[PDB]
Amino acid sequence: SGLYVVHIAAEMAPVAKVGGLGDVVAGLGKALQRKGHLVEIILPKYDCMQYDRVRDLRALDTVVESYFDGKLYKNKIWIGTVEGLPVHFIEPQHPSKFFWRGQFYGEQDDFRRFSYFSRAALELLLQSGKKPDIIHCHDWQTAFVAPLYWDLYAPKGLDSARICFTCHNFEYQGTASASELGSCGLDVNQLNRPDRMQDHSSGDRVNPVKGAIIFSNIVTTVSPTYAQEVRTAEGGKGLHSTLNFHSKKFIGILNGIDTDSWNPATDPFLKAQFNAKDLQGKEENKHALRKQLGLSSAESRRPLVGCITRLVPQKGVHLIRHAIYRTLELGGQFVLLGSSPVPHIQREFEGIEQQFKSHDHVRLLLKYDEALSHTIYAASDLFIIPSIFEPCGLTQMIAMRYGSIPIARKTGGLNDSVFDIDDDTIPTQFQNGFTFQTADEQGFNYALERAFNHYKKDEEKWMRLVEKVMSIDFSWGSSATQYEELYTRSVSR
Ligand SMILES: C[C@H]1O[C@H](O[C@H]2[C@H](O)[C@@H](O)[C@@H](O[C@H]3[C@H](O)[C@@H](O)[C@@H](O)O[C@@H]3CO)O[C@@H]2CO)[C@H](O)[C@@H](O)[C@@H]1N[C@H]1C=C(CO)[C@@H](O)[C@H](O)[C@H]1O
Ligand SMILES: Nc1ncnc2c1ncn2[C@@H]1O[C@H](COP(=O)(O)OP(=O)(O)O)[C@@H](O)[C@H]1O
Ligand SMILES: OC[C@H]1O[C@H](O[C@H]2[C@H](O)[C@@H](O)[C@@H](O)O[C@@H]2CO)[C@H](O)[C@@H](O)[C@@H]1O
């Protein structure tokens, strides 16, 4: 009655996490495991992995030889249990030291790093005689699995599985010169054709995500609205034509969040616990965070605006910058937790931070910090996501789970999860926050103004909004069932 489902990905929360992809792999993984499926995950063994939620971590005695550049290479296989999921971590013994770089992403040879991993992952499956019903791969890094499976593993004895591919951001396609596709074992001449993996915008380049759209039996992305956006020329980023052709098997499914990990009632990272029925502990976290950061608590009813994000153009960094000053102008406080891989963006925020070193109302925390994010979601009254585009976004869901009311731009997943309380056309049950259309200060200001007005003018009306938003189901229940139905329908076919 239950499927055997393997997920191959570059991330899994909390052990190897950069953003939402890692969150999703774990969250969907666990939801599927509750539904009775044998779920297993295959990751790289990064040197920079987070050890502390890994149980029973051990190196197996079986070495697994894997192909790359015409030679076979040794891989140490590790197993462990990460939040009840079985995980296989691949440690390559290739002289280039692919997962020994101090970093998850951003090396000059990422293409080689993750195409190797993709090959070795399938090799691990073959060599253990595993016969999965579903192999689910994620983003460009493991897009290589789809053509690899069909070209080299279905005709070697591994022909049990259907392939599912999720793209969590179609911006990242993994494009490179065609020469580089041959490293993992794929036939360049066969696959560098317009009906296969040749890029949309060049002749001697290949496109991993395009290959995964073509070769997979199921293709998803992470919200219904984003799925529509990427079918248009302007949002598709070259791939719109391919997605329109293969539309029958392409569907957008709104991510959930892991509501066991993200739960104010049992969150171990918090000072005080709380829930929809008792917000006592929310005010206590607001006070604790102020005290930890050196923000003023002299006034009651000063709204704390939080923002937790990677600082990259996608997230509307000019609007985030503006929001700091506007929040302050409007008589609120602001806490930013974020860092940028882009130095000019890091430098711009570093300047703002110094400006507010020990200010009573503004603190900027320019770093990745898990513990702190928990207390920021808990403490904050308002949470901003003014994204230029957003495939899904999880932070707005986590914020609402912790009672913080979102202010979001109407785009991609935010359009499917955030609904303005002042728009009459929206049914009352969905209304949970504040939105704006245009990506400029004027648009953002009107949403922020209304949110500050609502917070200040009627405390008990506001408290109902918090209660209501905290009672919304953000779990994977609903969306895990949609993935399950795609899996079963493909297996039967
Ligand atoms: C958070 C984000 O993580 C992943 O994105 C990473 C890329 O996959 C990496 O390759 C790397 O991007 C570099 C490019 O490859 C390189 O060519 C150059 O353009 O520089 C880039 C930046 O160094 O780094 C990216 C992260 O910085 C993942 O693929 C992406 O999907 C993730 N974000 C989405 C995930 C979810 C979860 O479903 C959605 O909710 C969010 O809306 C997405 O934003
Ligand atoms: N600076 C940071 N410190 C701690 N957690 C962060 C930071 N930036 C982002 N996160 C976390 O990463 C995840 C972001 O996922 P998502 O909203 O899908 O955006 P993206 O995938 O583009 O980063 C959330 O769990 C969020 O709390
Ligand atoms: O090999 C070329 C071919 O690969 C994929 O074909 C799969 C197909 O998707 C599965 O349903 C099943 O029939 O196995 C096939 C492997 O040969 C792509 O789907 C197809 O478009 C591509 O050209």
Author numbering: 23 to 515
Cite, word for word, the article reporting this structure.
Here we present three new crystal structures of SSs of different families and origins: the crystal structure of the catalytic domain of SSIV from Arabidopsis thaliana (AtSSIV), of GBSS from Cyanobacterium sp. CLg1 (CLg1GBSS) and of GBSSI from the glaucophyte Cyanophora paradoxa (CpGBSSI). In all cases, they are in the closed conformation forming ternary complexes with ADP in the donor site and the inhibitor acarbose occupying the donor glucose and glucose acceptor sites that approximates the active site at the time of the reaction.
AtSSIV binds ADP through an extensive network of interactions, depicted in Figure 2. While the adenine is bound exclusively to the C-terminal domain of SSIV, the rest of the molecule also interacts with the N-terminal domain. ADP binding occurs through a large number of close interactions and hydrogen bonds, with most of all possible interactions utilized in the case of AtSSIV. Interestingly, the entire set of interactions involving ADP binding to AtSSIV is present in the EcoGS structure, including mediating waters with one exception, the interaction of O2 with Tyr393. Only minor differences are found in the way acarbose is bound in the AtSSIV structure and only these will be mentioned here. The third hexose, here stacked between two tyrosines, has its O6 oriented differently since the threonine bound to it in CLg1GBSS is substituted in AtSSIV by a valine which cannot make side chain hydrogen bonds. Lastly, the reducing glucose is missing the interaction with an aspartate described for CLg1GBSS, as AtSSIV is missing an extra loop present in that region in CLg1GBSS.
